[PDB]
Amino acid sequence: YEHTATIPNVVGFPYKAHIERNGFSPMTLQLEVVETSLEPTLNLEYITCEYKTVVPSPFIKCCGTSECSSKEQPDYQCKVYTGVYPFMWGGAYCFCDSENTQLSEAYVDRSDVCKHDHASAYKAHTASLKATIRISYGTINQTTEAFVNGEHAVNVGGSKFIFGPISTAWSPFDNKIVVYKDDVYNQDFPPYGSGQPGRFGDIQSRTVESKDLYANTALKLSRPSPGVVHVPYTQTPSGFKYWLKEKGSSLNTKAPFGCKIKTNPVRAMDCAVGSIPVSMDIPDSAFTRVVDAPAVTDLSCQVVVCTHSSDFGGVATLSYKTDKPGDCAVHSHSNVATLQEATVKVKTAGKVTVHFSTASASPAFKVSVCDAKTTCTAACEPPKDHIVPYGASHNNQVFPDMSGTAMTWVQRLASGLGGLALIAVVVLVLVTCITMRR
């Protein structure tokens, strides 16, 4: 038996689905989203970390000359300075006063803890949303995980549910993502082989274990100062150690829709965006036969109080006939007002009370208790408390019913003016007829 619904993608909003299977007493299912996890497909572009600059002891050649050579090492710099005369602590190092050279050599390397302290630059696309849904009905009250696509059917008490494709393509991750430990950053990092000195990615590695390394740190050597053995050089400070203080706060503090961002794996939890279709197949053991249900009849509704507050600020009393005591499914057939309870005990006392939440000055929702139907009309006052620590339990439908006071005044004014206009029309038509016959 197929049935379908569409629950809000709102965590902890306990949407209630009503099934009116014609052979059976109705049932209300509660479908509460316990978690969602929107996880992008990630392709790693490269790894960035702090560089190490290797500066060996200078090869000072006393009484002679030396020649530099090229080497296959990142950002490698090598120059031979002629006419050095270095002093060590005990005296001049060379006997030749000017016939000496210093070979100054330096190059960049991946730092020794880049195994442990690195930022991984990713492309993030084609996100898959998984949700944890709590299903309850009758004696069944269970939590299950389902991929939110039109495909992953999941069993609950012998029911099968398909949580159809999320009604949006939105995700908080931009196309380029930088991940670092517990954080995620929306950052248009430069391509591999294209990083610039002192900015993020001034050294780049395709993987952590890659033996190759791109480096562009603006390393330049300069001449040993007169009388000193020092290999003097200038280099732009590590763009990763700049980034680490320039990052600001991560996407976890900036994502829209209240998403909570986590790593390992990179995911956006509990985003409040869009809505989730549901396909529900329910076995005959879940329902109750109409012969066993109570014959709830002559149902009527009166509203004790209503506040259009974010909690269940309305209270109604429903009154009815019944043949037997029992349980009935109860539902509100209009999104203007959501009920708190899914089922109500029916008794020969012939009345019971039901609580609802609404966002409108005068809702005219209609409710059922078992097979019986009635319409509830409320006059709802505004809440006094400006701010609350919880989200709205209603669907935020605010337009008042046409039977409400504001729309009753609108209807009186509109029918007054239109009736006068139609009088003027009828007069003008009868005058133009008579003055045509003349």
Partner: protein, 104 residues
């Protein structure tokens, strides 16, 4: 510090404390079941721009419809009384002159 809170809500975090979420309710100054101006005050309170627009639109349509009723009844009067006003030897009859409010 003052944080603007809409009915969509905010999340704030202070120092190392866990973040706290808060949502604004539909509080408003007016009375939803009062006299008409109290209802306009009500909606204006929780929906300012929309109420101003809706009331401007409806009151413009009210003026346009009233003006149409006036222009139509004036056209009826004028087309009825024209043959009596043009004729030299005549005056609007004693019955019709009251109903259409003839000039004499």
């Amino acid at each position: 510090r003052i944080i603007p809170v809409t009915e969509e809500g905010i999340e704030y975090q202070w120092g190392n404390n866990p973040p706290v979420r808060l949502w604004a309710q539909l509080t408003t100054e007016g009375k939803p079941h009062g006299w008409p101006h109290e209802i306009i005050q009500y909606y204006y309170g929780l929906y300012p721009a929309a109420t101003i627009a809706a009331v401007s639109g409806a009151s413009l349509m009210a003026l346009l419809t009233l003006a149409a009723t006036c222009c139509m009844l004036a056209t009826a009067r004028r087309k009825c009384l024209t043959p009596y006003a043009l004729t030299p030897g005549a005056v609007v009859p004693l019955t019709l002159g009251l109903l259409c409010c003839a000039p004499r």
